[PDB]
Subunit: 336 residues, 2 copies
């Protein structure tokens, strides 16, 4: 029995992505019940990604899980779910997450354990220092620096150098940057990378538009920092084409349809000699903890989505000494 | 606590691969104990494959599992095991199988279920009709035909056509052929495939030498039947290079180091649009059942290794209506 309902996320402060800012995030909460056990799932829909409460609710209304008598049939069930529409990846991820939570609960084990991973190998999560006045930027950097081991800064915008200079003036913490397809000039991107390297940046994400894979490859081949693909991929079938152009890939549950496909993407990337990082949207601890289950296998992680909302519905993974920390709760590791 | 000992397999009849005939098979049985629970593993070493009782026993003696207090640490443990030597894949597979059996038992579930597969989707296994005089071939074919849905024939010899016609004179069952790198001329290989298809053959395995990948791609591109790679690959790192040259890959536990890598190979092959088949050496039901755990994801399966030995130590998967049949026992699904 699957039930679902809209649950708008309330953000603590204005959150900006490229040229889009917001203080809330459409979201749908899902639950799958089987013999008295409940698995929790979630779909998060940043507006610019194309899904809405309406599209997600409508997709979920197409899903018939009552015809399936065994929750452990993840391959068959999720293949069926994927077949219902061409995309709606966040809606599909919600079903996948709830099913994994349910299955893990029935097995009495967290997915990091089912997958055979060492929870002590979880990564440090980045936390974003948003664009603002120099004084505010310096203030916010000082206020959080003591809780994280690495900070994230979004570039590919107006005053990238100034932002880095401002932040670096009050902290020596390593910085990961996301250019979000902001640099269209191949040489400018490479020069920026060298400058950022000099300023203590340790990783670069999607420096150029996905259409310019050729230019991206040229940059990565000469880059002293690992370059990760984000906008350049969504699902499993998009990974192989990036071999040789990117150092690694970024995986997000809302983009890839959930945990099962995410794990396959980790396997594929690694098998192809590529590195892996994991990201997230502003989400409750349901989706954040779900993604955290495979974090012991990633190089970088931006798993702070729940920290930006004021109405989390679950207690799941926590940031301890700046490190994503998995509890021993079965399934995706959350308590409602 | 891991213990191990040699256990030579006794074959029911002379078994021949290419020009090498034998009546026994070196094998090492492994056991890993944790809090009263025991996981069973196995290494099978057909002489021509490079490993021996000595090499396997010596490798196992290097493995320190006592330093590991959690059997669920499959990633860390098996990474460590692999790091102990360049090859010894059968010896490594033995540890992997025992660990999966143990973990599955601790979770109270068989691996097909842990992997989220539908056991009803297991494949029909081939059974081999060995080369011999026409009278014997017809007799052996008639004797087993009623228990299988597909038969295997090893070609690449000097009497391939007669062999196929002799078998076809007593049965209408589909046939899968393994040329074992027997055809050196790509034109001949292609012509043979067309001839075989007209004779009811449904799959071709390793038609040419692995050194002639270009000719293989040439054949496969215009082949009316799926072409699978066997001798052309050993492990996960060898798969990608075969994309576009082969229709699919053949996975064997003794070649790939076990279940964990095998499953990754299935994922990789499928992600790359390649099909998958699974094979085996003459083995006890331990290794056969272990490989059978992921058979619901394969297109073809040669999982009859235990049927050729007279001293099986386990009761595991069975052939029912010609289909590999998984029981509900946890781990790899065997009873000692
Ligand atoms: Mg990004
Ligand atoms: Mg073969």
């Amino acid at each position: 029995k699957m039930t679902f309902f809209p649950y708008e996320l309330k953000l603590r402060h204005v959150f900006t992505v490229a040229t889009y800012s917001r203080t809330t995030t459409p979201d749908v909460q899902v639950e799958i019940e089987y013999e008295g056990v409940t698995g929790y799932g979630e779909a998060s829909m940043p507006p610019y990604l194309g899904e809405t409460v309406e599209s997600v609710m409508n997709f979920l209304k197409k899903v018939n899980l009552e015809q399936f008598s065994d929750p452990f049939q993840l391959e068959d069930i999720l293949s069926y779910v994927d077949s219902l529409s061409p995309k709606d990846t966040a809606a599909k991820a919600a079903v996948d997450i709830a099913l994994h939570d349910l299955v893990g609960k029935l097995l009495g084990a967290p997915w990091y354990k089912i997958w055979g991973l060492n929870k002590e190998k979880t990564p440090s999560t980045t936390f974003t220092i948003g664009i603002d006045t120099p004084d505010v930027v310096r203030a916010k950097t000082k206020e959080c620096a003591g809780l994280f081991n690495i900070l994230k800064v979004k570039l590919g915008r107006d005053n990238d150098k100034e932002m880095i200079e401002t932040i670096r003036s009050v902290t020596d913490l390593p910085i990961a940057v996301d250019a979000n397809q902001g640099w269209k000039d191949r040489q400018y991107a490479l020069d920026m990378i060298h400058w950022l390297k000099e300023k203590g940046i340790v990783m670069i994400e999607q420096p150029m538009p996905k259409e310019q894979l050729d230019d991206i490859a040229w940059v990565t081949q000469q880059s002293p920092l690992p370059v990760f693909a984000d906008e350049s991929l969504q699902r499993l079938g998009d990974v192989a084409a990036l071999k040789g152009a990117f150092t690694g890939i970024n995986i997000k549950l809302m983009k890839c349809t959930g945990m099962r496909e995410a794990w396959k993407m980790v396997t594929l990337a690694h098998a192809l000699g590529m590195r892996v990082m994991v990201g997230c949207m502003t989400e409750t601890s349901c989706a954040i903890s779900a993604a955290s289950q495979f974090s012991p296998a990633v190089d970088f992680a931006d798993l702070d989505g729940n920290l930006l909302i004021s109405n989390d519905r679950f207690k799941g993974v926590e940031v301890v000494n700046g490190k994503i920390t998995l509890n021993d709760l079965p399934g995706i590791g959350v308590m409602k």
